[PDB]
Ligand binder design. Structure first.
Ligand code: NKI
Ligand code: ZN
Length: 208
């Protein structure tokens, strides 16, 4: 039931998504090992992900969280990178998309930094890089990320350098506590708490 609707680059919606993607690139502590060396992207395409059933699954869960948290879903737009991007957009988020080994337990992880999600496009640690060249810093091959609507509800704050949410919380927030430039990362433990709104196709660009 999923359809992908291409956005024109002239559309304000394309432009505001491209800007969140570009403006939230940062340097990483691995010097580019996982995700490659780049300061910006070449955005090739942005598509709206349309699936009525998956949307109703999200809004239903959203209302449940909202009603457990003084009518506040605490909804964010966040990036997700995964080798399973095509299963996600067709069947929705679930336990098979969890980062079992993540620092805040087995759950589904999202980033404010687009460059952080870029590190998982080819697997944990970047895997072996692109399928074609085996290069984690490939500048040729086309990458995809999701820009997702995520319900955090009451989020457990972890200060720092599938399972269940901590009792009385709907998510975990990984607060950056050493790298002053890092933005937060977030974990949900229910796939129904994220909806993959935008499929972004891009290349990382070689710095000049
Ligand atoms: O975009 C994210 N993708 C995940 C991820 C996705 C799929 C698999 Cl298999 C493993 C991990 N990890 C992240 C960790 C922190 C912030 C963002 C992300
Ligand atoms: Zn490649």
């Amino acid at each position: 039931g999923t359809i992908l609707i291409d956005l024109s680059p002239d559309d304000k919606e394309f432009q505001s998504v491209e800007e969140e993607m570009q403006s939230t690139v940062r340097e990483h502590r691995d010097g580019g090992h996982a995700g490659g060396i780049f300061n910006r992207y070449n955005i090739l395409k942005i598509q709206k992900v349309c699936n009525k059933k998956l949307w109703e699954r999200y809004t239903h869960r959203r209302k449940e969280v909202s009603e457990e948290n003084h009518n506040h879903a605490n909804e964010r737009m966040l990036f997700h990178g995964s080798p399973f991007v095509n299963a996600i957009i067709h069947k929705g988020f679930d336990e098979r998309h969890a980062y079992i080994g993540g620092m805040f337990g087995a759950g589904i992880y999202f980033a404010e930094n687009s460059s952080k999600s870029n590190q998982y496009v080819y697997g944990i640690g970047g895997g072996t890089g692109c399928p074609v060249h085996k290069d984690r810093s490939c500048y040729i091959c086309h990458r995809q990320l999701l820009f997702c609507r995520v319900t955090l509800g009451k989020s457990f704050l972890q200060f720092s350098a599938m399972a269940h949410s901590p009792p009385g919380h709907h998510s975990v927030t990984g607060r950056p506590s050493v790298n002053g430039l890092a933005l937060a990362e977030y974990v949900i433990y229910r796939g129904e708490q994220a909806y993959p709104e935008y499929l972004i196709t891009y290349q990382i660009m070689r710095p000049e």
